[PDB]
Design a protein around this ligand. Sequence first.
Ligand SMILES: [Ca+2]
Ligand SMILES: [Ca+2]
Length: 269
Amino acid sequence: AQSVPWGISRVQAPAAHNRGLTGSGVKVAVLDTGISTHPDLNIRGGASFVPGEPSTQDGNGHGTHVAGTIAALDNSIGVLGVAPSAELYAVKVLGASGSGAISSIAQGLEWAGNNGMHVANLSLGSPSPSATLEQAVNSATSRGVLVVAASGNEGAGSIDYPARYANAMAVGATDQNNNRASFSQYGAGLDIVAPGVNVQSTYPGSTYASLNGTSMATPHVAGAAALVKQKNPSWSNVQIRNHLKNTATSLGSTNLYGSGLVNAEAATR
Ligand SMILES: [Ca+2]
Ligand SMILES: [Ca+2]
């Protein structure tokens, strides 16, 4: 039996799926700890920029979880992604430990822009700026990639890099009450929010686990971007990003929530 995680329902993905929008033909790169082979995922390709982990398989669990929020297959098992038909690429930029070097992250973005990815999911971030990272974000953006990044989990009124950068779409986390999750970073540069508490998704060992974080929020938005891209094949990264913000549900202060809660039903109308 397949279940629909609360976050998926919250952003109204099923509403879009019922119009025939599933992210078909949209390439989405997950820059994380890898993506493990799993019955509820369809992994098309990828690369590893982590020396010592040549494989794209996930030794952490984070990348697998993020991947399932975007594209867990619509079938009779497991869960359901926001864009269950999206073409998923495992881009390993973090090791099993869940940490990585900036250069691996920049190489992953370069890779995304060189392989014609439409969306890059970066559920990672640092409080410090990086010239190398910035340049990578900007290069992937002028290559047509929509870069989506987590705002950070420190609960402070400033957001992490790369989410803070103008060309990155910064995502914060909401709870079941449509309030900002206590850990969700907010402030200047925040674009939008999505569910980030108790998020059930795919996990290594062919199972399912529930996590919390802005890392869980991010994929909801990467998935919503694929739905819009499928509907509007001619739109650029920028047009998609503005549309998502334009159709978000206002939740209160823009300092805390940016545009509001992503809404895939409204964005695919
Ligand atoms: Ca499934
Ligand atoms: Ca931003």
